[PDB]
């Protein structure tokens, strides 16, 4: 390599000013790895070259990285490895790149392919839904002759070097080298690496409807494994690459494609459209916005700026979405620290409107729509052979609902399969099944949001208020709040309605989502010896006034009456259970029961 190395050589003296600002960063991350591990009684090798600093004073060295990125990456590795030992070697893994920056119109949505930038750089976004296995793989073993006591050294290349077209080495353990020594190999002195195949869908909103969502796939490496949950808005960028032999294999390969498009990539980025950083300024404003004695009322009407009223409902959603704690019993069954509300209403009264705008501020809570299929909380042994001979229990919809919220529609308009499905997973936090394989108790902290319609028209006043839809009352007993939405005619109400549907054809949301996702990580009081005294007076009267009124209650309803006020103090962001929380919890039930 003489002439193919001089521009590689010229880069080695060039970009040392580009990491004038990173030559500290490359060594400072590993001196504490030489100090955490030496004093136990941890980070990968990630070197974020900004594209700006390379673009700012180089053109020919820059232009090749977006035209022919197949001769130019093991240059930048080769300078980088010798600037690690020459920095630090005295205390007694090639430091590959990450390559973040901007790109200038390479946001190819994989519904579209390339015709010109094949084998180039490409930025790709979307959602992943495949999440296949994890499995190690060698790169190099170290043979050893026991007789004469001397080692050997051999590398085995694969489709993981990403750029060079190496002659493959399909050998597993080449034994008996040119000697008479029965060979050994110190596998602890060997080295290994892993693979993970994941397919990415299309974000199904900016793809115009003339096709179903397509998909491609990406092979990544050790640094970013177990990072992507199924259901994350991910952003990845790597090289484009074809492999395999096709079309001109030995015989009879007619009308068979032979170029598997792959991506060998880096820098998997989550996005939000957990990463929400905040300075001292905005964290102090929410302390200043924790100060007033009205913030539970201001946050209620600042949520859905299209619909009038229902402030009992509008407080309930924000009370539910932030959620309450579950103190797990030591050597005992934890109770239902989740909360599960329900709605029902005579039709076209926005009972389904507010169920889907919670999904925009979901904070990684992707819900379904409730289609009559088994798979709501199971797998039913879908394996697809897991690349020829492995069986996996691929999770349907409970790997996503953990510490999140879901919502489903048309409860009464289902078959019998979901009725036994929501039976177990409500009284029990988990599910366990051996469909065709093994029992496995995988856990899930989830909470439903319901919606249903009464069958017999406008009959919610002339008949029994209970037994009203006759879906099994085990679920009615396992839920608490059954709001009956009224739509009676008031001549000032509909007059006010008539203008608010006209002024919608043209204190804020991102501050709201930051508030709850900061208040999910602070303290939990649970304790005031007199706030617990007022609520039992506030229950035993209606425990004697349950059959003399419309609805009978149960003993588990007492666990609601702590749980609502428990999260109501989380709105206050205080380590004390106050007294004022035992007044909102009273009258909210008093509207749900009278």
């Amino acid at each position: 390599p003489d002439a193919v190395f001089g521009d590689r050589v010229r880069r080695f003296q060039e970009f040392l000013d580009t990491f004038t600002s990173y030559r500290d960063s490359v060594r400072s991350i590993q001196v504490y790895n030489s100090n955490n591990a030496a004093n136990y009684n941890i980070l990968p090798h990630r070197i974020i070259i900004s594209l700006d600093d390379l673009r700012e004073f180089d053109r020919s060295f820059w232009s090749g990285i977006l035209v022919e990125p197949a001769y130019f990456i093991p240059p930048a590795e080769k300078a980088l490895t010798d600037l690690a030992d020459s920095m630090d070697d005295v205390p007694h893994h090639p430091w590959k790149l990450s390559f973040k920056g901007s790109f200038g119109a390479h946001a190819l949505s994989p519904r579209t392919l390339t015709a010109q930038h094949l084998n180039k750089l490409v930025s790709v976004e979307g959602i992943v839904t495949k999440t296949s296995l994890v499995r190690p793989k060698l790169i190099r073993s170290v043979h050893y002759a026991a007789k004469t006591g001397r080692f050997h050294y051999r590398d085995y290349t694969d489709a993981t070097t990403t750029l060079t077209t190496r002659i493959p080495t399909p050998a597993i353990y080449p034994t008996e080298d040119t000697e008479g020594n029965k060979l050994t190999t110190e596998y602890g002195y060997s080295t290994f690496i892993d693979h993970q195949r994941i397919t990415v869908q299309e974000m199904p909103e900016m793809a115009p409807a003339g096709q179903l969502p397509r998909s491609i796939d990406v092979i990544l490496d050790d640094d970013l494994v177990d990072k992507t949950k199924p259901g994350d808005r991910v952003n990845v960028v790597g090289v484009f690459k074809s492999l395999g032999a096709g079309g001109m294999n030995q015989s009879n390969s007619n009308t068979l494609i032979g170029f598997k498009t792959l991506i060998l990539g880096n820098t998997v980025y989550p996005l939000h459209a957990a990463r929400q950083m905040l300075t001292d300024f905005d964290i102090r404003n929410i302390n200043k916005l924790s100060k007033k004695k009205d913030i539970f009322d201001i946050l209620s009407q600042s949520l859905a700026p299209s619909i009038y009223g229902h402030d009992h409902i509008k407080k309930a959603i924000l009370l539910m979405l932030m959620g309450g704690v579950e103190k797990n019993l030591e050597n005992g069954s934890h109770l239902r620290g989740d909360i599960n509300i329900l709605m029902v209403g005579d039709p076209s009264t926005a009972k389904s409107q507010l169920l889907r705008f919670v999904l925009n501020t979901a904070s990684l809570a992707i819900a379904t729509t409730g289609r009559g299929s088994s798979g709501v909380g199971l797998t039913a042994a879908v394996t697809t052979d897991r690349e020829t001979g492995e069986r996996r229990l691929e999770a349907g919809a409970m790997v996503l609902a953990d510490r999140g919220v879901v919502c489903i529609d048309e409860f009464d308009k289902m078959t019998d399969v979901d009725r036994v499905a929501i039976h177990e997973v409500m009284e029990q936090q988990t599910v366990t099944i051996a469909k065709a394989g093994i029992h496995t108790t995988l856990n899930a902290r989830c909470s439903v949001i319901a919606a249903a319609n009464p069958v017999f028209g406008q009959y919610d006043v002339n008949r029994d208020p209970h037994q009203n839809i006759a879906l099994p009352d085990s679920l009615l007993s396992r839920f608490d709040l059954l709001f009956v939405v009224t739509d009676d005619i008031n001549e000032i109400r509909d007059r006010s309605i008539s203008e608010h549907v006209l002024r919608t054809h043209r204190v804020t949301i991102p501050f709201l989502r930051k508030y709850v996702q900061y208040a999910k990580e602070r303290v939990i009081p649970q304790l005031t010896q007199e706030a617990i005294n007022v609520i039992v007076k506030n229950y035993t009267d209606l425990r004697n006034d349950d059959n003399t009124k419309k609805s009978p209650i149960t003993a588990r309803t007492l666990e609601t009456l702590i749980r609502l006020a428990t999260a109501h103090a989380k709105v206050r962001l205080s380590k004390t259970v106050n007294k004022v929380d035992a007044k909102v919890a009273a009258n909210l039930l008093r509207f749900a029961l009278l």
């Binding site: 700006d52 673009r55 901007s102 790109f103 200038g104 119109a105 115009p208």
Partner: protein, 159 residues
């Protein structure tokens, strides 16, 4: 010029703030506006209100997304770029910015842009969902009268 195109281009906005406290409020009770408060400002008053004092009333807060986040994006590849969704008029907004502030740094970076963008529009001039034509939005006066030049010149040149 009776300004048929640009006073609407001067109908656009700026986020900015103050240095003093004035009871002149039209934006709503509590007429003295407290100082150092971020206020959306139209071009016409705010172009000269950052002039009249020594120390002027308003504070020029630069919309630095027009100064760092896209200045590298326009540095990359000026063949397909958002000149449009960030500014419905990039041009005179870049002009009237550079008079009051007079920064020679970005005075270079659009001098490279306009010849490269027009390098399309000459050799692209021989003869769709919600907004997505907008790549061809701030080019309308620029080339369309040149398009009628090449149209009629063929029509005399043929029969």
């Amino acid at each position: 010029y009776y300004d048929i195109d640009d006073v609407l281009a001067d109908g656009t906005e700026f986020p900015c703030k103050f240095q003093y406290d004035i009871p002149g409020l039209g934006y709503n009770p509590g007429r003295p506006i407290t100082k150092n408060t971020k206020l959306s400002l139209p071009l016409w008053l705010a172009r000269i209100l950052a002039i009249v004092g020594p120390v002027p009333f308003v504070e020029l807060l630069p919309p630095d997304m027009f100064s760092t986040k896209v200045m590298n994006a326009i540095k990359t590849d000026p063949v397909a770029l958002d000149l449009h969704s960030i500014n419905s008029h990039f041009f005179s907004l870049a002009i009237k910015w550079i008079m009051l502030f007079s920064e020679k740094e970005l005075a270079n970076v659009v001098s490279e842009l306009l010849l490269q963008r027009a390098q399309e529009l000459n050799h692209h001039a021989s003869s769709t969902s919600t907004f997505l034509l907008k790549l061809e939005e701030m080019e309308k006066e620029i080339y369309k009268k040149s398009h009628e030049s090449y149209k009629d010149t063929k029509r005399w040149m043929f029969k």
